[PDB]
Design an enzyme around this catalytic site. Sequence first.
Site, PDB file in Angstrom:
ATOM      1  N   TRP A 153       6.672 -16.031  -4.037  1.00 38.86           N
ATOM      2  CA  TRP A 153       5.523 -15.893  -2.749  1.00 38.86           C
ATOM      3  C   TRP A 153       4.736 -16.936  -3.719  1.00 38.86           C
ATOM      4  CZ3 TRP A 153       0.046 -13.144  -4.061  1.00 38.86           C
ATOM      5  CH2 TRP A 153       0.193 -12.912  -2.061  1.00 38.86           C
ATOM      6  N   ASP A 198       5.106  -7.337 -10.408  1.00 39.21           N
ATOM      7  CA  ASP A 198       4.807  -7.758  -9.343  1.00 39.21           C
ATOM      8  C   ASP A 198       5.270  -7.036  -8.289  1.00 39.21           C
ATOM      9  OD1 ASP A 198       3.496  -8.406  -6.750  1.00 39.21           O
ATOM     10  OD2 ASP A 198       3.925 -10.303  -6.425  1.00 39.21           O
ATOM     11  N   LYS A 201       2.918  -3.065   2.521  1.00 38.29           N
ATOM     12  CA  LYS A 201       3.866  -2.758   3.638  1.00 38.29           C
ATOM     13  C   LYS A 201       4.599  -1.461   3.344  1.00 38.29           C
ATOM     14  CE  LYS A 201       3.456  -7.485   2.196  1.00 38.29           C
ATOM     15  NZ  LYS A 201       3.652  -8.814   0.372  1.00 38.29           N
TER      16      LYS A 201
HETATM   17  C1  LIG Z   1       2.730  -9.465  -0.280  1.00 38.02           C
HETATM   18  C2  LIG Z   1       3.280  -9.284  -1.307  1.00 38.02           C
HETATM   19  C3  LIG Z   1       1.906  -9.007  -3.036  1.00 38.02           C
HETATM   20  C4  LIG Z   1       1.153  -8.522  -2.610  1.00 38.02           C
HETATM   21  O1  LIG Z   1       0.857  -8.685  -1.000  1.00 38.02           O
HETATM   22  P1  LIG Z   1      -1.086  -7.683  -0.554  1.00 38.02           P
HETATM   23  O2  LIG Z   1      -1.427  -7.888   0.510  1.00 38.02           O
HETATM   24  O3  LIG Z   1      -2.714  -8.509  -1.371  1.00 38.02           O
HETATM   25  O4  LIG Z   1      -0.855  -6.278  -1.393  1.00 38.02           O
HETATM   26  C5  LIG Z   1       2.697 -10.055  -3.549  1.00 38.02           C
HETATM   27  N1  LIG Z   1       3.490  -9.844  -4.291  1.00 38.02           N
HETATM   28  C6  LIG Z   1       4.858 -10.409  -2.816  1.00 38.02           C
HETATM   29  C7  LIG Z   1       5.922 -10.850  -3.714  1.00 38.02           C
HETATM   30  C8  LIG Z   1       4.457 -10.492  -1.834  1.00 38.02           C
HETATM   31  O5  LIG Z   1       5.370 -10.250  -0.986  1.00 38.02           O
END
Ligand SMILES: *Cc1c(COP(=O)(O)O)cnc(C)c1O
EC number: 2.6.1.1
Lengths: 396, 396
Positions: free
Chosen positions: A130, A211, A246
């Site tokens: 990410w 994460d 999500k």
């Molecule tokens: C979406 C995401 C997050 C965190 O998103 P927040 O909207 O800030 O909760 C962290 N890691 C990955 C791989 C993501 O896709």
Amino acid sequence: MFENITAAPADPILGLADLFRADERPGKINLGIGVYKDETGKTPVLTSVKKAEQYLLENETTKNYLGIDGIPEFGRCTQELLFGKGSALINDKRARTAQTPGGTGALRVAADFLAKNTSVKRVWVSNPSWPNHKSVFNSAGLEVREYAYYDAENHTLDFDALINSLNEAQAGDVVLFHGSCHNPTGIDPTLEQWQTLAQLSVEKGWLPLFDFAYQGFARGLEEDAEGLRAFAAMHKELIVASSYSKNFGLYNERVGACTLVAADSETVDRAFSQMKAAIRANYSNPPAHGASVVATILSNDALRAIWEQELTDMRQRIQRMRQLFVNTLQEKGANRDFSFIIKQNGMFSFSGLTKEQVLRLREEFGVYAVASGRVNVAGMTPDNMAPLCEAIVAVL
Amino acid sequence: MFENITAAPADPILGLADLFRADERPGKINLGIGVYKDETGKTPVLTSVKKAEQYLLENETTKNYLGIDGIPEFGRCTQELLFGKGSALINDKRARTAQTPGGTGALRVAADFLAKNTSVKRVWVSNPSWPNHKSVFNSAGLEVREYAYYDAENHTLDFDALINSLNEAQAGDVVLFHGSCHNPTGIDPTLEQWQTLAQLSVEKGWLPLFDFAYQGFARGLEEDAEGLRAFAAMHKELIVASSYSKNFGLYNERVGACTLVAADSETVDRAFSQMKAAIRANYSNPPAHGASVVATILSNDALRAIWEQELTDMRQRIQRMRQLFVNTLQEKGANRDFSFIIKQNGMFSFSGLTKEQVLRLREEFGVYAVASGRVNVAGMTPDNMAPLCEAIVAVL
Ligand SMILES: *Cc1c(COP(=O)(O)O)cnc(C)c1O
Ligand SMILES: *Cc1c(COP(=O)(O)O)cnc(C)c1O
């Protein structure tokens, strides 16, 4: 002071919006951002959250400050969802969790705590990962080293190269693992593969930082947690940053948590106070709304049952679009095997597209995918599924 | 890594809670934290926000991500509330605002933007000031120097000493001013005094950073903005961090904003992108709830009118408790003139108490005030007003 100032560059993901959004072109397809989209192409607010929100509206008596770590109840639930219902980390009091403004804010709160109360100076992040990862950690003063991950030829997890880039990571360094639904590859390690990384990590003296931004989107809520749990069984110290954006569709309310497990109660208590000091210096205490929604749903057996059904539907729709994608391509005219995307999990997938194919769809066809060749499958419907695979067989 | 870790010390304000809260003593009085409290001693949720919240509940269609800077509408309103309805900064497009998680998060977002896109390395903060100020700035790597402010003998603004500590501040340094309701003294500069600081600051090459956490609590919403507006008339660059926690009673929802005015459009646009890059690396985008509540109330003329009436009542109740305090003391037996507290404004006041008098009330009497001798008047009722002034004349 601001006369010098250099313009900041584009966010790798969020810059494409203003190009689809601002594209005055008619027959478009977005496929960029990692926000779920239903059968109609709408990102609706879950039914279980609408119900928890009228409940809050009838029952909230004050908007008075939450503690630095937030809603206690929200803390407990995040722990059980992660470690398990009868988890010893919970029973021995080795875990402490703070509610934070998103998964990103839990990442950053981890960053600032480590960068000022600890030895660590380096964070290992996969290739690819990410995009905002690097940027969060670097903001804390730490530096991002990147171990290898993906076999661009076989569309799988290159395990050997993984191990072979990781030994350069010395002890007291932090290795960052995606708990489930690897962003952007979608390739995840098997349980055997995690039981292995668990021992290489205990043996090499690493600090694991998980994460968790898609628990429930690969196989289930408990299944997707087996890796973290395998690591939490043999490590005495680890941290995990999770997000409810999500999986509860609570994107813009910023709800996530940063849990810290230490060797024992005394240590996690003492280490947590410093984590708290870090929060108090950033944003003072966390935002109540989205967290109380999550605490209410998870606390109530009627509401929770609707929530899991909703998650189960989102999961089952993506799992169906993936199959629709490999089949429609196989029928529209493709001289390429995309069967690998059926084996990948979560909202994302790495097509086998070049930065010049991505640019060819986006221009000559209006279909939008990040230059990375990453397409969000939870943004494909049976309706758009046809002009999509047509554009892809044209560009192939 | 966490075996070394040193326990963090007490937050100067938030540590007293667990002492009142955890005090199993009966006849208590809190007087510590800066959260408003009505006639009954409850921190109720405003009527205008309850109405905006059922409205959001009926109308929200998605929880999809807000932009990095948040709700546009919320941006515009914050600007008009601050600079004025027909303000040239707004007309010339010199202002840009980002919604942030609280006034504290707007302070910090200012910190991180300055600390990495700019010359500044020092921030001047009054003596005394809101405790967490120093801590936010130091977290950004900057250092806190403190100009003088308060005459502990005459209970007023020592203007001369103010000016005489400020010349040590060199150009390209940031001076931080409380817009209205100075925390903790309650002493505020006159308009003439601001028109003076405005020119000393333009002449000396300073960067003003206004902390606006109580607009509407001293005299009015426009009156309390005259100082900032006097400074914004002659400076080409300035930043202001504001909070809607106390004036909308939205404490735990974390709503505030960080506005940045530059010499012109091109500069503020370019400088804002870096401010945005700073946000994207902290918490990704802001929390929607409390901000949309504020945008809705301020946008709707029926709801806004109820809101200002509610603010007007909170303001008028504190203004009445102050007078109740100086009178009850004058009747209960006091050999000291507390008339100065009647001339001070906002929720707080610096009694003339020693750290050993504060400790004497808290122990022998259960009345809680920060060791600072700061008592929140918006926490006094006509009911507790008697055992209060009794305790104070005992300790005097
Ligand atoms: C979406 C995401 C997050 C965190 O998103 P927040 O909207 O800030 O909760 C962290 N890691 C990955 C791989 C993501 O896709
Ligand atoms: C309360 C306060 C703030 C900001 O509080 P938030 O809850 O983070 O908005 C800033 N400055 C002073 C002087 C305050 O009292």
